[PDB]
Every structure is written in structure tokens, then in C-alpha cells.
Amino acid sequence: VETGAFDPSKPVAISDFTPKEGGAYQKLLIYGENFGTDVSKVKVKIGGKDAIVINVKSTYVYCFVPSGAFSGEIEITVGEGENAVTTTASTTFSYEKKMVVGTLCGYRNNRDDQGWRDGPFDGPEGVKCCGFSDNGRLAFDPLNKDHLYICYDGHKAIQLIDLKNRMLSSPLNINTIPTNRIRSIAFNKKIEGYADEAEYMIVAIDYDGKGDESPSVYIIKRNADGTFDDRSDIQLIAAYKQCNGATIHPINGELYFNSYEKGQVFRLDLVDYFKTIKNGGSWDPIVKNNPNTFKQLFTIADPSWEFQIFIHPTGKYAYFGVINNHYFMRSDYDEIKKEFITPYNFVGGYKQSGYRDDVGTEARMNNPCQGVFVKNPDYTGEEEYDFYFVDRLNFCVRKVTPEGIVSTYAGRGASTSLADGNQWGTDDGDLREVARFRDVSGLVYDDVKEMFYVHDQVGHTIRTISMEQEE
């Protein structure tokens, strides 16, 4: 062989590589000897995973770090058959793990005829659980994050996704609720003299069968054994019409709920409710007849405005997600009055659906659904959180900084959307290169395990976003 050509009678050596650490898709430069000058004659594995070889030039090889290369062991084989020579680098590459999309439970077969079935997360079709097909919202039991509840707009049971025993059940059949349009789940904060922390599940429903005296919000009391099920006491706490959600202030504990009719936002101090029942009184849930107790703070925009309220963990502000008109508004909280004030347009285009990462009202989204605040360790001032939400008709999770910069966090996998031409899909893995979702409606974040659970309504699955693990 000539100068620079591969010599199969001599060893192949790796002397160094750079960078020494990195994540999947990182370009890696490997230095050594006897690599030859042809990509076709070189194969590289990193952490036991086959790696894409970019260029080979005698004393160096460029390749891409593969997903899941945990061990960082670098192995190279030059030549083929009788002439193949292999070596392994003496030091390991330091693989930096990334968040990845996974699938927890649920499935959709080729005929989409699996239906609904309670049971184990895993097993053969016919045994493993499935359903999850109506638009939904997620909420953890604040006293036990192994218990993840899901409510649905179109399925009249609130289900329990039990992460510890890996079982799906339907403990809440809410038979007295007059509709299957269940919109949200919240829990009370402790109320001195009246209610322990999360003793009550607060459930919003979307109904207008009794005109403007139609139920909006119910309250369900935890059983003596700690469960929420059909033995639980359930009471009507507010009735107007067309409610799309109810949310609890994380510091002061009052309840905010709306009506789509004119986009009203109502404020209820639960102390009024518990004080009345404690003194053997009759509670009147008819909002219109009691303007001092169910205080109407404002209308956020125009009539027929469908939205939910997401309050910052400090309680100092909230985002109002306008599901049917494709934007979020922001509202500041007056800490002395203990009320939110008239909101203003924050991110997205007023009545203009689309998909565009940009700043403020130049960003575009399409049917924004559930959102959550997540601590960003890089923030050091008084603002410590970013906001993440499922953008339903764009099949992804978006991120919103406090300044209003909107980006795409997970979904619409670049490589997978090329293979089949669809921005939607079921692929697990790398957040923006591979992973895909179908219509996404629900989202929660476990702030201790540092992971998201996502309700993929049209995939009929519960997905996860969490740190990859060596199996």
C-alpha cells in the first residue's frame, strides 16, 4: 500500500478524540493510525451503537455520536473479511444524556378498533390498557404523585393512571354530573378551620342544558382511606354555563373559573362555601343571583371565548390560554386585593391559527391546550420559570419564556417527518430530530422526577418526556 493507504498487516490505533464529552448528534473527531482514505471501508461503534461515518483521512476519522451511546466505548473496524482490523480506544467518550420522548401506556392498532379497556400498562393487545381518545387534561394528586388523574371532554369517567402499580382504572363515574364534557381537575389548598390540603378535588364541566343556571363546577371530597371514588361525597359549588376550566390560586387558595359565553372570569373564596355548610346553611350555586360571592372580575375579550387559566407558582401572574382563538393572554395579580387584573395579549396571533416560533404576538399556534410552569436552573432573579404547553393541531410541546419568546420543545421530528411527509406521528426518542405526537391536549410536569406526562389524544396514548436511561 502507498503512503496514507490502509495496511491490513499493521494494527489500527486510536490516539485521541475531541471533544471528550458530548451528546447525540455531536460531531466527533477521532485521531489515530491506519484508517485508510475510504468511508466505505470504515465502521465505527460508540457505546455499542453504530455511528455515522462522515470522512476518513488516514490519521483521523469524523463521525456523529449516536443516540444512546452510554458507555462511550469507541470501537473502529477498518477493512473487510480477512483484511478487517479492529481496535478499541483506551479511554471512553463521556456521553451526555438527553431528554427523550417515550410511551407510557395506551395504543392504537392498524384498524384503530382497540376501544377502551382498564388494566395493566403492559401485556398483549386484549389485556393491556387502552382508550384515551377524547380531548383530555391531566392532574396529579398533590399528596401522591404516583396518582395521575385524567379527565375527558366526551368520556364520563375520570380515570386514574397509577404510576406505581402500572394500572389504569376508572374510580370516578360521577353519575350525578349532567354531561360527559369534563374540562379540568384542581385541588384546594389548606383552608385553616375548614379543609386540609387537597381534601377536595374541584372539577369543571362544560354544560348549558339549563340555560344560565347550568352547573359549572363540582367539589369531590376525599374518602377516609385517602381515595377519590364513587363513595366520595360530591356537591355542586358553582353554576352559570359553558365553563371551560377552574383553577386554584397556589398561594391564597381562591378559585377562578370562566364562562365561554362572554369570556367571563369569576372568583370564589371557598371559605364562603365551607363556612355556610359548617353552620348548617344551604349553599346557592347560582352565580347570577350572588354577584358578591361569585365575583365577576372582567371579560377577557369577545364573546364565545374558550379558555383555561394557568397560574405561575409564585401566584404573581397567570396566562389565559384561548383554545379556540390561538393565543395566550397574561394577567398580573394584585397581591393586596388578592385578584387578577384585566389581561393583555401576550403570545400568539389573535384569531390567527398557524405554526411559527417567534416573539410575542408574532408567534403562531393552533388550539393551545394544557400548560405548565417549569423551573429553569439557569434563571437567577425573581423569575425562575419557563412555561410549556401542548399546541394541539401542531402536534408538539412549545416553550414560552417570561419575555414572550416561543419555541418548539418536543415533537415534529425532522428525520421522521421526512420519511412519510407528516408532521404528526408516534415516534419516540430525540425531542426534535425523531419524536412525534398526534393531537396533544394534556400536560403535567413532575418537578421532583423532572419529567413530563403528555396526553396524546389522537395517538390514544400517554407519552413521557424524561431523561434517557441505560436499560
Of 132-140, 319-327, 341-349, 440-448: span binding a copy of itself (CB under 8 A):
341-349
- Minimum Å distance from CB 29 to a copy of itself? 5
Shortest distance (Å) from residue 407 CB to a copy of itself: 12
Q: If binding means CB under 5 A, how many residues of this protein chain bind Zn ion?
A: 7
What residue has cell string 471501508? Answer: 41
| Residues 10-39, mask of contacts with Zn ion (x by CB under 5 A) | ------x---------------------x-
Between 32 and 368, CB nearer to a copy of itself: 32
Q: Does 332 bind a copy of itself (CB under 8 A)?
A: yes
Sites for a copy of itself among residues 12-31 (CB under 8 A) = 18-21, 29, 31
Q: Does the protein bind a copy of itself through residue 382 (CB under 8 A)? A: yes
Cα–Cα nearest to 210, from 272, 288, 268, 156: 288
Name the binder of 467 from a copy of itself, Cl ion, Zn ion, none, CB < 5-8 A by kind: none
Taking CB under 8 A as the criterion, the residue among 1, 11, 57, 209 binding a copy of itself is: 57
By the rule CB under 5 A, 252 interacts with Cl ion: no
Written as nine digits, the cell of 110 is 392498524
- 348 binds Cl ion per the rule CB under 5 A: no
Of residues 49, 98, 316, 338, which one binds a copy of itself by CB under 8 A? 316
> Is 121 or 387 the residue whose CB approaches a copy of itself more closely?
387
| Residue 252 binds a copy of itself, judged by CB under 8 A | no
Question: 99 vs 286, which CB is nearer to a copy of itself?
Answer: 99
Q: Which residues are annotated as a binding site for Zn(2+)?
A: 16, 38, 147, 155, 162, 196, 199, 213, 334
Which of 9, 110, 336, 382 binds Zn ion (CB under 5 A)? It is: 336
Q: Is 338 in the site for a copy of itself (CB under 8 A)?
A: no
The residue within the footprint of Cl ion, chosen from 67, 159, 247, 367 (CB under 5 A), is 367
Answer for which of 16, 21, 80, 362 binds Cl ion (CB under 5 A) is 80
19 binds, among Zn ion, Cl ion, a copy of itself, none (CB under 5 to 8 A by kind): a copy of itself
* Residue 342 touches a copy of itself, criterion: CB under 8 A: yes
Q: Counting contacts by CB under 8 A, is residue 3 touching a copy of itself? A: no
| Contact residues: Cl ion, CB under 5 A | 79-80, 83, 323, 367, 392
Q: Which residues bind a copy of itself (CB under 8 A)?
A: 18-21, 29, 31, 55, 57, 60, 62, 316, 332, 334, 341-342, 344, 378, 381-382
